[PDB]
Amino acid sequence: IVGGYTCQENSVPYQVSLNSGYHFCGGSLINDQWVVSAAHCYKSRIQVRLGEHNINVLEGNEQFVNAAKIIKHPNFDRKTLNNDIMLIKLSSPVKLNARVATVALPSSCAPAGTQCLISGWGNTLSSGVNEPDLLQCLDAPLLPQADCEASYPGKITDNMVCVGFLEGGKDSCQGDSGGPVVCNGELQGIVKWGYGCALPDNPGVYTKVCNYVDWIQDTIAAN
């Protein structure tokens, strides 16, 4: 997260860190046994870490759980990043509590202008790389599709939404990928991509979760 602020400890309880011996992507806990992330975050073996604040220090709220089933969207297009959504079934249910909680799926697609919260342990610089210890937070609005398309001529599908600021300075970045965009308590986006990070005229692009509730439900039910 570039230009965000340090979240209050355990204030984003649905936030998870995907680990492979190092943090490489975020995700969201949607039920005691399933995590939603980005298909581009796929790895054959993943340890999901919940209840994290300081990614490098054991603080006593952590739950570490291996992924049992990693299911990328059948239509994920690695090239265009269309359908960049993945489901992780954990090897065992987590203990839900105050620091480890679920986020709701969207009842409807959010209108442009709604204020959302984005979080992650992603890169904090607009240039170069800086990995933070503490979870970062960013308040940012969902932009009109026209602004999104305009910024990325020919690349935005209807499964994508832009969130951020046309002025730059504030945005998600590498390492925030697969992480959540929560608006009015519902998961509306997944950190996907953007050109650079926090650059003027290059808002972040996110997977539009409201287009996948059916799929998410079907999959959970079938697995």
Q: By CB under 8 A, name the binding residues for its own copies.
A: 21, 123, 125-129, 173-174, 194-199
Distance of closest approach, residue 112 Cβ to Ca ion, in angstroms: 36
For CA atoms 77, 82, 83, 84, the dihedral sign is positive
From the CB of 58, what's the least distance to Ca ion, in Å?
5
Please state the closest distance from residue 79 (CB atom) to its own copies, in A.
15
**Annotation marks residue 40 as catalytic:** yes
Q: Interface residues with Ca ion (CB under 5 A)?
A: 52, 54, 59
Binding residues for Ca(2+): 52, 54, 57, 62
Torsion, CA 188, CA 155, CA 149, CA 169, rounded to 10: 70
31-46 residues labelled b (16+ CB within 10 A) or e (exposed): bebbbbbbbbbbeeeb
Q: Where are the alpha helices (DSSP H) in the chain?
A: 145-151, 213-222
171 given a catalytic annotation: no
**What, of Ca ion, its own copies, none, does residue 59 touch, CB below 5 to 8 Å by kind?**
Ca ion
CB of 195 to its own copies, least distance (A): 7
Catalytic residue status for 11: no
Report the C-alpha gap between 174 and 172 in whole angstroms.
7
Residue 93 contact partner, candidates its own copies, Ca ion, none, CB within 5 to 8 A by sort of partner: none
Alpha carbons within 13 angstroms on the beta-carbon side of residue 123 total 14
Q: Which option in its own copies, Ca ion, none does residue 128 bind, with CB closer than 5 to 8 A by kind? A: its own copies
Residue 74 contact, options Ca ion, its own copies, none, Cβ 5-8 Å cut-off depending on partner type: none
Range 62-101 burial, b when 16+ CB lie within 10 A, else e: bbebebeebbbbeebeeeebbbbbbbbbbeeebeeeebbb
Nearer to its own copies, 122 or 180 (CB): 122
Closest to its own copies by CB, 3 vs 13, is: 3
Single out the residue of 7, 200, 215, 23 nearest to residue 106, CA to CA: 215
Which residues 6+ apart lie within 8 Å of 44 measured at CB? 70
Residue of 23, 28, 84, 171 with catalytic role: 84
Q: Of 25 and 173, which has the nearer Cβ to its own copies? A: 173
**Known catalytic residues?**
40, 84, 177
